[PDB]
Each structure stands twice: as C-alpha cells, then as structure tokens.
Symmetry: C2
Subunit: 85 residues, 2 copies
Amino acid sequence: VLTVSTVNSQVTQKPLRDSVKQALKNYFAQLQDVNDLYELVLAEVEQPLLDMVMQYTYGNQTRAALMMGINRGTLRKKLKKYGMN
Amino acid sequence: VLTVSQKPLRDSVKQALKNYFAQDVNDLYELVLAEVEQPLLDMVMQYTYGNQTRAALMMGINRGTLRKKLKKYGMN
C-alpha cells in the first residue's frame, strides 16, 4: 500500500493519492485554463516510478518490466519518451 | 508544475515507492497508476461539477476514455 510520510505543523503518514489531491488542488488555484492535465500528471508520476524501478533492477529492462507488470516494448516506449533510455 | 505545499509531486511518488520497495512486486505500474488516476478523476470531476465534457477537454482525453476510467474506479 503506497504511502508517504510527512511532517505537519508539529510528523504524518498518508497514502500517495493524498499528495496527488493536494498537488491537483494547489494546481487549480494556480490557474486560467487547462487542456492537457492528464498527460501532465502521468509524466509527473511515470518518471519517478521508472527511476525507482530501473534503480532497483540496475537498469535491467527485463527484470524491471517484470516488476511493474508490463511488457518490455511498453517499458521501452516510456523510457524513450522520458529520455531515460 | 504539480507540487505539494514546496516540492514536486514526483518526490512523494518516489518516497512512496521507497518505503514500499523497503519490503515482491508483479503489477507495480497499475498499482501506482490507480493511486494517481482516482484522485485525478475525482479532483477534475469535482472541479467541473460533473461536466464530463469540460473534464475530458481539461484532461486532454476523449469522453470515452473518461467514462472508461471513471467507471474503472466505480466513480460512475
């Protein structure tokens, strides 16, 4: 269960989606028109995911793709997309 | 651009994967994706007050994809 630790005014522990809700919330007030919010968020999440995965598997695509649950082709598509290849 | 009150959202994702990895995986992608789509759909839908037309435009996806996803997370 993906969770994130944090420190409040005085330390705490909420799921990942919360951080997402906050960023989205914060983002809206930041406006004054959006048109590619999806791809925008995906990228802000796929890359860190890729890093963590690739880091674990010492860049071993195969062993990495097997972890995320996707085929090598796709993985390569994303890496190349985020220029990590 | 997507940050939380002041670092990027990606940092949270990275830490969440850090604590998680600190424990095997088989469908990590979907795991993370759902953890990101639900709140997204939810936030956008609430933002456009249920106006799926504005929502899809805002997200950059067709009405179908939006209905598909919303339905996927029982947000229908």
